[PDB]
Design a protein that fits this description.
By secondary structure, the chain is an alpha/beta fold. It has one domain: Rossmann fold. Helices cover 24% and strands 25% of the residues. It is built from five helices and nine strands. Strands 1-2-4-3-5-6-7-9-8 form a nine-stranded mixed β-sheet, sandwiched between helices. Helix 1 links the parallel strand 3 and strand 4. The longest helix has 16 residues. The protein is globular, with a radius of gyration of 17 Å. The relative contact order is 0.15. Bound molecules: a molecule of 2 linked components (NAG-NAG), 3-(4-hydroxy-3-methoxyphenyl)-2-propenoic acid and magnesium ion. 3-(4-hydroxy-3-methoxyphenyl)-2-propenoic acid binds next to loops. It is classed as hydrolase.
Length: 242
């Protein structure tokens, strides 16, 4: 179902500021090349990593921008202290405030709201899946871990996890913990997920879960690096199935 912003004159793309409980915070809004204000769009949050900023995720959005056509609106929010510590839920509240604002300004399909990010931004995507499973259709942490909290975390939500076997910063076992939570929440049948050897190609494992709540795990043989050529393709294909 489409939001109240449908049919309204659109704002401009660029850096926006927003008051969150007295705290001034900032995000980048990127409209598609051809924005039809009468068509419901996907909404994709891309979340930066530690010591990064919103300006590192924009303009490429982990490879999604080049694949998305006119179907998606992109948002790159800025973390406090170049991170997503999410103290007391303040970063979940930030996302709540962005959503309230953009849904009233833009034509968004409420069943196509997504979040993805790398490392600390993958932790933050996980926190949104824990606390806002009613809002987000799917999350895709890249080298994620439980480092931004997880309040709630019992509801199902479609999940794609990507992680490198030789990641020395957030070891892959931390990403498997995130995955295993949604294998339980989504009612997935137990299944072995093989992971590649050194110098071997990525291995994607698709689980059998409740119909609306798929779980996919992709392990690649590299390290702490989101710039693999399959990343944008796999995330887009996962998001566009809904
Ligand atoms: C908003 O998004 C939903 C889900 O993507 C759309 O519902 C889909 O409609 C297409 C039409 O063939 C089919 O793939 C399915 O029937 C629906 N997919 C689901 C429910 O996952 C919906 O049409 C979009 N637009 C509006 C106005 O709701
Ligand atoms: C190991 O624990 C942590 C790791 C990170 C790394 C974030 C990043 O690389 O983006 C952040 C916070 C942590 O508590
Ligand atoms: Mg298109």
């Amino acid at each position: 179902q489409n939001t109240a912003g449908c049919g309204q004159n659109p704002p401009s793309s660029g850096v926006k500021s927003i008051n969150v409980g007295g705290m001034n915070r900032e995000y980048i809004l990127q409209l598609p090349n051809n924005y039809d204000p009468n068509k419901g769009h996907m909404l994709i949050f891309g979340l930066h990593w530690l010591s990064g900023s919103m300006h590192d995720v924009h303009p490429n959005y982990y490879g999604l921008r080049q694949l998305a056509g006119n179907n998606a609106i992109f948002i790159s929010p800025n973390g406090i202290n170049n991170g997503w510590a999410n103290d007391g839920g303040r970063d979940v509240n930030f996302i709540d405030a962005i959503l309230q604002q953009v849904r009233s300004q833009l034509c968004i399909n409420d069943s196509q709201i997504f979040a993805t990010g790398f490392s600390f931004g993958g932790g933050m995507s996980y926190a949104l899946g824990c606390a806002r499973a009613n809002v987000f259709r799917a999350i895709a942490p890249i080298a994620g871990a439980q480092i931004s909290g997880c309040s709630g975390g019992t509801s199902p939500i479609a999940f794609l996890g990507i992680h490198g076997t030789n990641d020395d910063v957030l070891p892959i076992a931390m990403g498997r913990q995130v995955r295993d939570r949604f294998l339980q929440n989504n009612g997935c049948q137990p299944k072995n997920a093989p992971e590649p050897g050194w110098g071997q190609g990525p291995i994607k494992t698709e689980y059998s879960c409740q119909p609306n709540y798929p779980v996919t795990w992709i392990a690649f043989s590299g390290g702490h690096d989101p710039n693999q050529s399959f990343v944008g393709r796999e995330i887009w294909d996962f998001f566009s199935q809904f």
